[PDB]
């Protein structure tokens, strides 16, 4: 379920992954909440439900409607200091964000791929998600099957689109970004994740970033090993947009 | 409707299976029936503390337990009349695998399907977003969700370092000892785990001849993705010659 924690003026938003759910950014929101901010977790549509064909039958282009919606839902409440955050998928619609509303005061991406590529990684990652997911399903094995055997095919559609979405509504306006961006990255391989970063970091010369590289820890930044110094480093990030 | 254990019984060779972390005997079922076909008995085994409907119940078992259950799973079918048996392993069912051929020559051969029998990886990750999803439809009201997924990042990392020293000082240290035909197989697109890390097996086992094979096309769970009927076909042929 998402969640909404209300404490402060400063209000932050936080999107998670692809397949994930607000459980991705839950305990990064207490260490935020712990410093008194309202911190706000939406869930993309198709997500959290017990059918991954949920997810699939959604569209990148909704999800950025989601992004959309639930920042006007915050200033609906009466905040006017909010930032926004995204993980993974999150990162590329938090940034989406950033680019059209100036008013936004800030926010970032964690290890958020914020130019279209090789997503190959993402696709057997899902199906892999998916059938550990459908062990405790209601689904019949039949159903199951169903389900697990028919989902490289969407899905690799699906995050086709996530990489059209990107290139042409969110890469292209990344010179519109105004505000001090946070970027952190998780990976064990520098060639390949940290890259990820810095490709988004050096498209970032008009504003300043603040860069942090979790090279012990893997992707999933939030909840690894790197979650106690990523969420002193949003802490610390967030002092100085506030 | 948690997931079994399953035990095809037909023929005097018999095969036991083993599942990955977090996961069950579905994990595994697949290529059961494709053994089954051939008239192969297999036994699929479940893990102590897994396939319930709390996390805490993987977290709260230690890999002493899991390789006493892979001891209890083959004398399991000693006493059921069987003799001729080999044994094989996913993700982490792969290392007790391992430690049974190491420690008993009476067994005809198996194997690994892309385990990680060194370091070389998203594995904690994987784990705290399935057990995020099993807490999302479980029993438990939402402040005890939040009160368990608050405290999975920290045992996860506990749990898999335990798991890394007991590969380390009780199978990967006595590769030597293997003394039967050895089968390796890993895919080429693994996502979860360092897939040179299965070459690394390979190397380290000069004394037995390797029945090694790549899925180059695939994902980590190579016994249910798309890599499955050629894993069967390969462990088929693998399993004629022991």
């Given at each position: 379920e998402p969640f909404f924690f209300e404490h402060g003026q400063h209000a932050v938003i936080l999107l998670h992954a692809y397949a994930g759910s607000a459980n991705d950014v839950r305990m990064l929101?207490?260490?935020?909440?712990?410093?008194?901010?309202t911190v706000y977790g939406p869930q993309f549509s198709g997500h959290a439900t017990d059918d991954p064909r949920d997810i699939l039958a959604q569209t990148p282009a909704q999800w950025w409607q989601d992004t959309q919606q639930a920042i006007?839902?915050?200033?609906?409440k009466g905040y006017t200091?909010?930032?926004?955050?995204?993980?993974?998928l999150g990162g590329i619609f938090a940034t989406a964000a950033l680019e059209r509303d100036p008013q936004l005061l800030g926010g970032?991406?964690?290890?958020?791929?914020l130019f279209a590529g090789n997503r190959s990684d993402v696709a057997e990652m899902f199906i892999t998600l998916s059938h550990h997911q459908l062990a405790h399903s209601q689904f019949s094995i039949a159903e199951r099957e169903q389900i697990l055997?028919?989902?490289?095919?969407?899905?690799?559609?699906?995050?086709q689109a996530v990489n059209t979405f990107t290139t042409t509504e969110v890469?292209?306006?990344l010179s519109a970004v105004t505000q001090p961006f946070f970027?952190?990255?998780?990976?064990?391989?520098?060639?390949?994740?940290?890259?990820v970063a810095r490709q988004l970091r050096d498209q970032l010369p008009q504003v300043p970033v603040d860069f942090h590289w979790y090279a012990d820890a893997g992707h999933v930044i939030t909840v690894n090993s790197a979650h106690h110094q990523?969420?002193?480093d949003v802490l610390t990030y967030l002092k100085t947009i506030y």
């Open positions: 929101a207490r260490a935020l909440e712990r410093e008194d901010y006007s839902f915050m200033r609906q200091k909010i930032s926004i955050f995204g993980l993974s970032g991406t964690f290890s958020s791929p055997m028919t989902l490289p095919e969407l899905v690799q559609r699906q995050l890469t292209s306006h970027i952190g990255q998780g990976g064990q391989d520098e060639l390949i994740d940290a890259t990523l969420e002193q």
